[PDB]
Design an enzyme around this catalytic site. Structure first.
Site, mmCIF file in Angstrom:
data_model
loop_
_atom_site.group_PDB
_atom_site.id
_atom_site.type_symbol
_atom_site.label_atom_id
_atom_site.label_comp_id
_atom_site.label_asym_id
_atom_site.label_seq_id
_atom_site.Cartn_x
_atom_site.Cartn_y
_atom_site.Cartn_z
ATOM 1 C CG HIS A 40 -3.184 3.735 -10.229
ATOM 2 N ND1 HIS A 40 -3.198 2.453 -10.739
ATOM 3 C CD2 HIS A 40 -3.077 3.604 -8.886
ATOM 4 C CE1 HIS A 40 -3.110 1.587 -9.746
ATOM 5 N NE2 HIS A 40 -3.037 2.259 -8.611
ATOM 6 C CG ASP A 84 -3.179 1.922 -14.204
ATOM 7 O OD1 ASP A 84 -2.332 2.837 -14.140
ATOM 8 O OD2 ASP A 84 -3.682 1.373 -13.201
ATOM 9 N N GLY A 174 -2.054 -1.326 -2.351
ATOM 10 C CA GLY A 174 -0.667 -1.498 -1.965
ATOM 11 C C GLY A 174 0.026 -2.436 -2.934
ATOM 12 C CB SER A 176 -1.603 -0.237 -7.019
ATOM 13 O OG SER A 176 -2.898 -0.367 -6.459
ATOM 14 N N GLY A 177 0.410 -1.536 -9.289
ATOM 15 C CA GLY A 177 1.647 -1.364 -10.030
ATOM 16 C C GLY A 177 2.482 -2.626 -10.088
#
Ligand SMILES: [Ca+2]
Ligand code: NA
Length: 220
Positions: A40, A84, A174, A176-177
């Site tokens: 995402h 994801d 923030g 994320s990933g």
């Protein structure tokens, strides 16, 4: 990261910042040429920043390498955020040193209750903790039972919850990933959650141990 602690500088040498003129997602270096992040967080071209601690201060430990290819997991779904995870190939290999190192990919899933560490430059919801400095948080993997209790009909087999059901500590926007490392192995990727650090709203992460087959095949 809310309720965490400033990571020891460069202790999470695999942590990278995905940049497009500003920090927008985290990521994890898994080899000199590859970075794992969340699908995402996808963008066709990405500037990968390695060796960072403070994302707004030139520390002399950074390496800025543009992506050459960004690949989302083939079964990724932008509807339920399933699978994801994505790979970013660096245009030039990163140099591994005291501030930049890859984290091991899992070949074995971790058990519930395992204590891990999640990190990122995401929101801290505090002035005491500056999100511009890499923040760290120790957190346990939660059972699927608790995950399904918190997010009815939203948790798939490629996801897992981790954190505190009592709230107060959690990853956030923030982050994320970013990585979730357990016993030195990357077991999760910061995916989603309802709000941040809220009671009964633990963070949801991509389950890397179930997605590592795809990662390894793509890297080869
Ligand atoms: Ca910096
Ligand atoms: Na793609």
């Amino acid at each position: 990261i809310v309720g965490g602690y400033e990571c020891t500088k460069h202790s999470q040498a695999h942590q990278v910042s995905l940049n497009s003129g500003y920090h927008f997602c985290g990521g994890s270096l898994v080899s000199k040429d590859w970075v794992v992040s969340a699908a995402h967080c996808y963008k066709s071209v990405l500037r990968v920043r390695l060796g960072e601690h403070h994302i707004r201060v030139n520390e002399g430990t950074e390496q800025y390498i543009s992506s050459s290819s960004v690949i989302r997991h083939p079964n990724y779904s932008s509807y339920n955020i399933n699978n994801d995870i994505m790979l970013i190939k660096l245009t030039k290999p990163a140099t591994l040193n005291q501030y930049v190192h890859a984290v091991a990919l899992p070949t074995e899933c971790a058990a519930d209750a395992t204590m891990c560490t999640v990190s990122g430059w995401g929101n801290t919801m505090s002035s005491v903790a500056d999100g511009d400095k890499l923040q760290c948080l120790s957190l346990p993997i939660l059972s699927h039972a608790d995950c399904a209790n918190s997010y009815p009909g939203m948790i798939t087999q490629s996801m897992f919850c981790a954190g505190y059901l009592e709230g107060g500590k959690d990853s956030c926007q923030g982050d994320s990933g970013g990585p979730v490392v357990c016993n030195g192995v990357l077991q999760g990727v910061v995916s989603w959650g309802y709000g941040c650090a809220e009671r009964d709203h633990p963070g949801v992460y991509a389950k890397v141990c179930v997605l590592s087959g795809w990662v390894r095949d793509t890297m080869a």
